[PDB]
Amino acid sequence: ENPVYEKKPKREVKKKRWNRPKMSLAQKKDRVAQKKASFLRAQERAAES
RNA sequence: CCUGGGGGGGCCGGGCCACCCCUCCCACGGCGCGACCGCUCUCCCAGGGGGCGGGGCGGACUGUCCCCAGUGCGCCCCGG
Ligand SMILES: [Mg+2]
Protein backbone atom coordinates (compact mmCIF):
# COMPACT_ATOMS: atom_id res chain seq x y z
CA GLU A 1 0.00 0.00 0.00
CA ASN A 2 2.86 2.43 0.77
CA PRO A 3 5.89 1.34 -1.28
CA VAL A 4 7.39 4.81 -1.77
CA TYR A 5 10.26 5.82 0.52
CA GLU A 6 10.17 9.22 2.20
CA LYS A 7 13.10 11.62 2.04
CA LYS A 8 15.00 11.83 5.32
CA PRO A 9 15.83 15.14 7.03
CA LYS A 10 18.99 16.68 5.57
CA ARG A 11 19.66 18.72 8.74
CA GLU A 12 23.22 18.14 9.94
CA VAL A 13 25.46 19.57 12.66
CA LYS A 14 28.93 21.10 12.67
CA LYS A 15 31.87 18.75 12.12
CA LYS A 16 34.83 18.22 14.44
CA ARG A 17 38.36 17.07 13.61
CA TRP A 18 37.70 13.61 15.01
CA ASN A 19 40.54 11.87 13.16
CA ARG A 20 44.17 12.88 13.51
CA PRO A 21 45.71 14.68 10.51
CA LYS A 22 49.08 13.96 8.94
CA MET A 23 52.02 15.96 10.25
CA SER A 24 53.73 18.07 7.61
CA LEU A 25 57.29 17.68 6.33
CA ALA A 26 58.54 20.45 8.62
CA GLN A 27 57.02 18.74 11.66
CA LYS A 28 58.48 15.36 10.65
CA LYS A 29 61.93 16.90 10.16
CA ASP A 30 61.69 18.69 13.51
CA ARG A 31 60.75 15.40 15.20
CA VAL A 32 63.75 13.74 13.53
CA ALA A 33 66.05 16.55 14.66
CA GLN A 34 64.74 16.35 18.23
CA LYS A 35 65.21 12.57 18.30
CA LYS A 36 68.76 13.02 17.00
CA ALA A 37 69.69 15.80 19.43
CA SER A 38 68.14 14.36 22.60
CA PHE A 39 69.90 10.99 22.15
CA LEU A 40 73.52 12.14 22.52
CA ARG A 41 72.76 13.93 25.80
CA ALA A 42 71.62 10.64 27.37
CA GLN A 43 74.93 8.87 26.74
CA GLU A 44 76.84 12.05 27.65
CA ARG A 45 75.09 12.17 31.03
CA ALA A 46 75.57 8.42 31.55
CA ALA A 47 79.29 8.83 30.83
CA GLU A 48 79.86 11.90 33.01
CA SER A 49 77.79 10.35 35.82
C1' C B 1 74.26 83.23 -77.27
C1' C B 2 76.74 81.26 -81.59
C1' U B 3 77.07 80.31 -86.88
C1' G B 4 68.44 81.59 -92.21
C1' G B 5 69.97 77.58 -88.97
C1' G B 6 71.82 75.54 -84.28
C1' G B 7 72.05 75.97 -78.58
C1' G B 8 70.07 77.84 -73.81
C1' G B 9 66.56 80.52 -70.21
C1' G B 10 61.46 82.59 -67.96
C1' C B 11 55.95 81.95 -68.55
C1' C B 12 51.30 78.38 -65.15
C1' G B 13 49.33 80.49 -61.05
C1' G B 14 47.71 77.67 -57.24
C1' G B 15 48.27 72.89 -54.00
C1' C B 16 51.70 68.96 -51.08
C1' C B 17 56.45 67.62 -49.11
C1' A B 18 60.81 69.53 -47.59
C1' C B 19 66.09 73.10 -46.34
C1' C B 20 65.73 77.41 -40.59
C1' C B 21 61.94 78.81 -36.00
C1' C B 22 56.57 76.25 -31.45
C1' U B 23 52.13 71.79 -30.35
C1' C B 24 48.33 66.75 -30.21
C1' C B 25 48.00 60.80 -30.77
C1' C B 26 49.64 55.84 -31.57
C1' A B 27 53.94 51.32 -31.92
C1' C B 28 58.79 50.69 -30.04
C1' G B 29 63.51 51.65 -25.86
C1' G B 30 65.02 52.86 -20.78
C1' C B 31 64.59 55.11 -15.99
C1' G B 32 62.01 57.18 -11.85
C1' C B 33 57.10 57.78 -8.99
C1' G B 34 51.45 55.46 -7.20
C1' A B 35 47.19 52.19 -7.60
C1' C B 36 45.14 46.22 -8.68
C1' C B 37 46.26 40.39 -8.59
C1' G B 38 49.31 35.87 -7.13
C1' C B 39 53.17 33.95 -4.31
C1' U B 40 56.67 34.95 -1.04
C1' C B 41 62.55 35.94 0.32
C1' U B 42 68.16 38.72 2.09
C1' C B 43 67.01 43.93 5.21
C1' C B 44 65.26 43.34 11.57
C1' C B 45 66.87 41.72 16.48
C1' A B 46 68.73 39.84 21.71
C1' G B 47 79.25 37.34 12.98
C1' G B 48 76.07 32.73 14.70
C1' G B 49 71.04 31.96 15.46
C1' G B 50 65.73 33.32 15.36
C1' G B 51 63.24 32.82 8.84
C1' C B 52 59.54 35.62 5.53
C1' G B 53 58.35 38.23 11.09
C1' G B 54 54.76 40.78 15.52
C1' G B 55 49.99 39.99 18.13
C1' G B 56 45.33 37.65 19.17
C1' C B 57 41.23 33.95 18.84
C1' G B 58 41.35 27.94 19.12
C1' G B 59 42.99 23.11 18.01
C1' A B 60 46.52 19.39 17.10
C1' C B 61 51.36 17.37 17.60
C1' U B 62 56.96 16.05 19.03
C1' G B 63 61.12 14.36 22.74
C1' U B 64 66.00 6.29 24.66
C1' C B 65 62.19 11.66 28.04
C1' C B 66 67.18 18.72 30.45
C1' C B 67 58.90 19.23 32.67
C1' C B 68 61.02 22.18 30.12
C1' A B 69 62.13 22.91 25.02
C1' G B 70 60.46 22.94 19.78
C1' U B 71 57.60 22.57 14.77
C1' G B 72 52.91 22.65 11.52
C1' C B 73 47.57 23.80 10.63
C1' G B 74 42.22 27.27 10.61
C1' C B 75 40.88 32.63 10.98
C1' C B 76 41.79 38.00 11.71
C1' C B 77 45.01 43.03 11.78
C1' C B 78 50.06 44.88 10.56
C1' G B 79 55.61 44.52 8.58
C1' G B 80 58.77 43.14 3.79
MG1 LIG C 1 55.94 53.28 -23.23
Short mmCIF file of all heavy atoms in Angstrom, two decimals, chain B residues 22-36:
data_model
loop_
_atom_site.label_atom_id
_atom_site.label_comp_id
_atom_site.label_asym_id
_atom_site.label_seq_id
_atom_site.Cartn_x
_atom_site.Cartn_y
_atom_site.Cartn_z
P C B 22 61.94 75.69 -32.21
OP1 C B 22 62.98 75.17 -31.28
OP2 C B 22 61.46 74.83 -33.32
"O5'" C B 22 60.68 76.13 -31.34
"C5'" C B 22 59.89 75.17 -30.66
"C4'" C B 22 58.54 75.73 -30.30
"O4'" C B 22 57.97 76.41 -31.44
"C3'" C B 22 57.48 74.71 -29.90
"O3'" C B 22 57.58 74.30 -28.55
"C2'" C B 22 56.18 75.44 -30.22
"O2'" C B 22 55.84 76.34 -29.17
"C1'" C B 22 56.57 76.25 -31.45
N1 C B 22 56.17 75.60 -32.72
C2 C B 22 54.87 75.82 -33.18
O2 C B 22 54.12 76.54 -32.51
N3 C B 22 54.47 75.24 -34.34
C4 C B 22 55.32 74.47 -35.03
N4 C B 22 54.88 73.92 -36.16
C5 C B 22 56.65 74.23 -34.58
C6 C B 22 57.03 74.81 -33.43
P U B 23 57.15 72.82 -28.11
OP1 U B 23 57.48 72.65 -26.67
OP2 U B 23 57.70 71.86 -29.11
"O5'" U B 23 55.57 72.81 -28.25
"C5'" U B 23 54.82 71.63 -27.99
"C4'" U B 23 53.36 71.80 -28.36
"O4'" U B 23 53.26 72.33 -29.71
"C3'" U B 23 52.53 70.53 -28.40
"O3'" U B 23 52.09 70.12 -27.11
"C2'" U B 23 51.40 70.90 -29.34
"O2'" U B 23 50.42 71.67 -28.68
"C1'" U B 23 52.13 71.79 -30.35
N1 U B 23 52.57 71.04 -31.55
C2 U B 23 51.64 70.78 -32.53
O2 U B 23 50.48 71.14 -32.45
N3 U B 23 52.11 70.08 -33.61
C4 U B 23 53.40 69.62 -33.81
O4 U B 23 53.67 69.01 -34.84
C5 U B 23 54.31 69.93 -32.74
C6 U B 23 53.88 70.61 -31.68
P C B 24 52.10 68.56 -26.72
OP1 C B 24 51.78 68.45 -25.27
OP2 C B 24 53.35 67.96 -27.24
"O5'" C B 24 50.88 67.95 -27.54
"C5'" C B 24 49.54 68.22 -27.16
"C4'" C B 24 48.56 67.39 -27.97
"O4'" C B 24 48.55 67.84 -29.34
"C3'" C B 24 48.87 65.90 -28.06
"O3'" C B 24 48.43 65.18 -26.93
"C2'" C B 24 48.17 65.49 -29.35
"O2'" C B 24 46.78 65.29 -29.13
"C1'" C B 24 48.33 66.75 -30.21
N1 C B 24 49.47 66.66 -31.16
C2 C B 24 49.35 65.87 -32.31
O2 C B 24 48.30 65.24 -32.50
N3 C B 24 50.39 65.80 -33.17
C4 C B 24 51.50 66.49 -32.94
N4 C B 24 52.50 66.40 -33.82
C5 C B 24 51.65 67.31 -31.78
C6 C B 24 50.62 67.37 -30.93
P C B 25 49.15 63.82 -26.49
OP1 C B 25 48.63 63.42 -25.16
OP2 C B 25 50.62 64.00 -26.68
"O5'" C B 25 48.65 62.75 -27.56
"C5'" C B 25 47.27 62.41 -27.67
"C4'" C B 25 47.06 61.32 -28.69
"O4'" C B 25 47.40 61.82 -30.01
"C3'" C B 25 47.93 60.09 -28.51
"O3'" C B 25 47.40 59.18 -27.56
"C2'" C B 25 48.01 59.53 -29.93
"O2'" C B 25 46.85 58.77 -30.24
"C1'" C B 25 48.00 60.80 -30.77
N1 C B 25 49.36 61.26 -31.16
C2 C B 25 49.93 60.82 -32.36
O2 C B 25 49.30 60.04 -33.09
N3 C B 25 51.16 61.26 -32.71
C4 C B 25 51.82 62.11 -31.91
N4 C B 25 53.03 62.52 -32.29
C5 C B 25 51.26 62.57 -30.69
C6 C B 25 50.05 62.13 -30.36
P C B 26 48.22 57.87 -27.15
OP1 C B 26 47.80 57.48 -25.78
OP2 C B 26 49.65 58.10 -27.43
"O5'" C B 26 47.68 56.76 -28.16
"C5'" C B 26 48.33 55.50 -28.25
"C4'" C B 26 48.47 55.06 -29.69
"O4'" C B 26 48.76 56.21 -30.52
"C3'" C B 26 49.61 54.09 -29.97
"O3'" C B 26 49.26 52.75 -29.67
"C2'" C B 26 49.90 54.34 -31.45
"O2'" C B 26 48.96 53.65 -32.26
"C1'" C B 26 49.64 55.84 -31.57
N1 C B 26 50.88 56.64 -31.45
C2 C B 26 51.75 56.72 -32.53
O2 C B 26 51.48 56.11 -33.58
N3 C B 26 52.88 57.47 -32.42
C4 C B 26 53.14 58.12 -31.29
N4 C B 26 54.26 58.84 -31.23
C5 C B 26 52.26 58.06 -30.17
C6 C B 26 51.15 57.32 -30.29
P A B 27 49.96 52.00 -28.43
OP1 A B 27 49.01 50.97 -27.93
OP2 A B 27 50.48 53.03 -27.50
"O5'" A B 27 51.20 51.26 -29.09
"C5'" A B 27 51.00 50.30 -30.13
"C4'" A B 27 52.28 50.04 -30.88
"O4'" A B 27 52.55 51.13 -31.80
"C3'" A B 27 53.54 49.96 -30.03
"O3'" A B 27 53.70 48.70 -29.41
"C2'" A B 27 54.64 50.30 -31.03
"O2'" A B 27 54.96 49.17 -31.82
"C1'" A B 27 53.94 51.32 -31.92
N9 A B 27 54.26 52.72 -31.56
C8 A B 27 53.50 53.62 -30.86
N7 A B 27 54.06 54.79 -30.71
C5 A B 27 55.28 54.66 -31.37
C6 A B 27 56.35 55.55 -31.59
N6 A B 27 56.37 56.80 -31.14
N1 A B 27 57.41 55.10 -32.28
C2 A B 27 57.40 53.84 -32.73
N3 A B 27 56.45 52.91 -32.60
C4 A B 27 55.41 53.39 -31.90
P C B 28 54.39 48.60 -27.96
OP1 C B 28 54.18 47.22 -27.45
OP2 C B 28 53.94 49.76 -27.15
"O5'" C B 28 55.94 48.78 -28.27
"C5'" C B 28 56.60 47.97 -29.24
"C4'" C B 28 57.93 48.55 -29.63
"O4'" C B 28 57.73 49.81 -30.33
"C3'" C B 28 58.85 48.91 -28.48
"O3'" C B 28 59.54 47.79 -27.96
"C2'" C B 28 59.76 49.96 -29.11
"O2'" C B 28 60.77 49.35 -29.90
"C1'" C B 28 58.79 50.69 -30.04
N1 C B 28 58.24 51.92 -29.42
C2 C B 28 58.98 53.11 -29.52
O2 C B 28 60.06 53.09 -30.11
N3 C B 28 58.49 54.24 -28.96
C4 C B 28 57.32 54.22 -28.33
N4 C B 28 56.88 55.37 -27.80
C5 C B 28 56.55 53.03 -28.21
C6 C B 28 57.04 51.92 -28.77
P G B 29 59.70 47.62 -26.37
OP1 G B 29 60.10 46.22 -26.09
OP2 G B 29 58.49 48.19 -25.72
"O5'" G B 29 60.94 48.57 -26.03
"C5'" G B 29 62.16 48.44 -26.73
"C4'" G B 29 63.22 49.34 -26.14
"O4'" G B 29 63.17 50.64 -26.79
"C3'" G B 29 63.07 49.65 -24.67
"O3'" G B 29 63.56 48.61 -23.84
"C2'" G B 29 63.83 50.97 -24.52
"O2'" G B 29 65.22 50.73 -24.46
"C1'" G B 29 63.51 51.65 -25.86
N9 G B 29 62.38 52.59 -25.76
C8 G B 29 61.11 52.41 -26.24
N7 G B 29 60.32 53.43 -26.03
C5 G B 29 61.13 54.35 -25.37
C6 G B 29 60.83 55.64 -24.88
O6 G B 29 59.75 56.26 -24.94
N1 G B 29 61.93 56.24 -24.28
C2 G B 29 63.17 55.65 -24.16
N2 G B 29 64.12 56.37 -23.54
N3 G B 29 63.46 54.44 -24.61
C4 G B 29 62.40 53.85 -25.20
P G B 30 62.87 48.33 -22.42
OP1 G B 30 63.17 46.93 -22.03
OP2 G B 30 61.46 48.78 -22.49
"O5'" G B 30 63.65 49.29 -21.42
"C5'" G B 30 65.07 49.34 -21.43
"C4'" G B 30 65.58 50.58 -20.75
"O4'" G B 30 65.33 51.74 -21.59
"C3'" G B 30 64.90 50.93 -19.43
"O3'" G B 30 65.41 50.19 -18.34
"C2'" G B 30 65.13 52.43 -19.32
"O2'" G B 30 66.45 52.70 -18.88
"C1'" G B 30 65.02 52.86 -20.78
N9 G B 30 63.67 53.34 -21.14
C8 G B 30 62.71 52.64 -21.83
N7 G B 30 61.61 53.31 -22.02
C5 G B 30 61.87 54.54 -21.42
C6 G B 30 61.04 55.69 -21.31
O6 G B 30 59.89 55.85 -21.73
N1 G B 30 61.69 56.72 -20.64
C2 G B 30 62.96 56.65 -20.13
N2 G B 30 63.41 57.75 -19.51
N3 G B 30 63.74 55.58 -20.23
C4 G B 30 63.13 54.57 -20.88
P C B 31 64.48 49.89 -17.06
OP1 C B 31 65.10 48.79 -16.29
OP2 C B 31 63.08 49.77 -17.53
"O5'" C B 31 64.60 51.22 -16.20
"C5'" C B 31 65.87 51.76 -15.87
"C4'" C B 31 65.76 53.18 -15.38
"O4'" C B 31 65.40 54.06 -16.47
"C3'" C B 31 64.69 53.43 -14.33
"O3'" C B 31 65.08 53.03 -13.03
"C2'" C B 31 64.44 54.93 -14.48
"O2'" C B 31 65.47 55.67 -13.83
"C1'" C B 31 64.59 55.11 -15.99
N1 C B 31 63.28 55.07 -16.69
C2 C B 31 62.49 56.22 -16.68
O2 C B 31 62.90 57.25 -16.13
N3 C B 31 61.30 56.22 -17.32
C4 C B 31 60.87 55.12 -17.93
N4 C B 31 59.68 55.17 -18.54
C5 C B 31 61.65 53.93 -17.94
C6 C B 31 62.83 53.95 -17.32
P G B 32 64.02 52.35 -12.05
OP1 G B 32 64.76 51.54 -11.05
OP2 G B 32 62.97 51.71 -12.88
"O5'" G B 32 63.36 53.58 -11.29
"C5'" G B 32 64.18 54.56 -10.68
"C4'" G B 32 63.48 55.89 -10.56
"O4'" G B 32 63.22 56.44 -11.87
"C3'" G B 32 62.10 55.86 -9.91
"O3'" G B 32 62.15 55.75 -8.49
"C2'" G B 32 61.48 57.15 -10.42
"O2'" G B 32 62.01 58.27 -9.72
"C1'" G B 32 62.01 57.18 -11.85
N9 G B 32 61.05 56.55 -12.78
C8 G B 32 61.06 55.28 -13.31
N7 G B 32 60.04 55.05 -14.08
C5 G B 32 59.30 56.22 -14.06
C6 G B 32 58.09 56.58 -14.71
O6 G B 32 57.38 55.90 -15.46
N1 G B 32 57.71 57.88 -14.39
C2 G B 32 58.40 58.73 -13.57
N2 G B 32 57.88 59.95 -13.38
N3 G B 32 59.53 58.41 -12.96
C4 G B 32 59.91 57.16 -13.25
P C B 33 61.20 54.69 -7.74
OP1 C B 33 61.78 54.42 -6.40
OP2 C B 33 60.93 53.57 -8.67
"O5'" C B 33 59.84 55.49 -7.54
"C5'" C B 33 59.83 56.74 -6.86
"C4'" C B 33 58.64 57.58 -7.23
"O4'" C B 33 58.47 57.62 -8.67
"C3'" C B 33 57.29 57.09 -6.73
"O3'" C B 33 57.06 57.36 -5.36
"C2'" C B 33 56.32 57.82 -7.67
"O2'" C B 33 56.17 59.17 -7.28
"C1'" C B 33 57.10 57.78 -8.99
N1 C B 33 56.65 56.66 -9.85
C2 C B 33 55.48 56.88 -10.59
O2 C B 33 54.92 57.97 -10.51
N3 C B 33 55.00 55.91 -11.39
C4 C B 33 55.64 54.74 -11.47
N4 C B 33 55.12 53.81 -12.28
C5 C B 33 56.83 54.48 -10.72
C6 C B 33 57.29 55.46 -9.93
P G B 34 56.33 56.27 -4.44
OP1 G B 34 56.19 56.84 -3.07
OP2 G B 34 57.02 54.97 -4.63
"O5'" G B 34 54.87 56.15 -5.08
"C5'" G B 34 54.01 55.07 -4.74
"C4'" G B 34 52.59 55.36 -5.16
"O4'" G B 34 52.58 55.92 -6.50
"C3'" G B 34 51.67 54.15 -5.26
"O3'" G B 34 51.15 53.74 -4.01
"C2'" G B 34 50.60 54.64 -6.23
"O2'" G B 34 49.68 55.50 -5.59
"C1'" G B 34 51.45 55.46 -7.20
N9 G B 34 51.91 54.65 -8.34
C8 G B 34 53.17 54.15 -8.56
N7 G B 34 53.27 53.46 -9.66
C5 G B 34 51.99 53.50 -10.20
C6 G B 34 51.48 52.93 -11.39
O6 G B 34 52.07 52.25 -12.24
N1 G B 34 50.14 53.22 -11.56
C2 G B 34 49.37 53.96 -10.70
N2 G B 34 48.09 54.12 -11.05
N3 G B 34 49.83 54.50 -9.58
C4 G B 34 51.14 54.23 -9.40
P A B 35 50.82 52.19 -3.74
OP1 A B 35 50.51 52.02 -2.30
OP2 A B 35 51.90 51.38 -4.37
"O5'" A B 35 49.48 51.93 -4.57
"C5'" A B 35 48.27 52.57 -4.20
"C4'" A B 35 47.22 52.45 -5.27
"O4'" A B 35 47.75 52.93 -6.54
"C3'" A B 35 46.72 51.05 -5.59
"O3'" A B 35 45.77 50.56 -4.67
"C2'" A B 35 46.17 51.22 -7.00
"O2'" A B 35 44.91 51.86 -6.97
"C1'" A B 35 47.19 52.19 -7.60
N9 A B 35 48.27 51.46 -8.29
C8 A B 35 49.62 51.45 -7.99
N7 A B 35 50.32 50.69 -8.80
C5 A B 35 49.38 50.16 -9.68
C6 A B 35 49.49 49.28 -10.77
N6 A B 35 50.64 48.75 -11.18
N1 A B 35 48.36 48.96 -11.44
C2 A B 35 47.21 49.50 -11.02
N3 A B 35 46.98 50.34 -10.02
C4 A B 35 48.12 50.63 -9.37
P C B 36 45.87 49.04 -4.13
OP1 C B 36 44.85 48.86 -3.07
OP2 C B 36 47.30 48.76 -3.83
"O5'" C B 36 45.45 48.15 -5.39
"C5'" C B 36 44.08 48.00 -5.75
"C4'" C B 36 43.90 46.96 -6.83
"O4'" C B 36 44.63 47.36 -8.02
"C3'" C B 36 44.43 45.57 -6.52
"O3'" C B 36 43.54 44.80 -5.73
"C2'" C B 36 44.66 44.99 -7.91
"O2'" C B 36 43.44 44.55 -8.48
"C1'" C B 36 45.14 46.22 -8.68
N1 C B 36 46.62 46.33 -8.72
C2 C B 36 47.37 45.40 -9.45
O2 C B 36 46.79 44.47 -10.04
N3 C B 36 48.72 45.52 -9.47
C4 C B 36 49.32 46.52 -8.82
N4 C B 36 50.65 46.61 -8.87
C5 C B 36 48.57 47.48 -8.08
C6 C B 36 47.24 47.35 -8.06
#
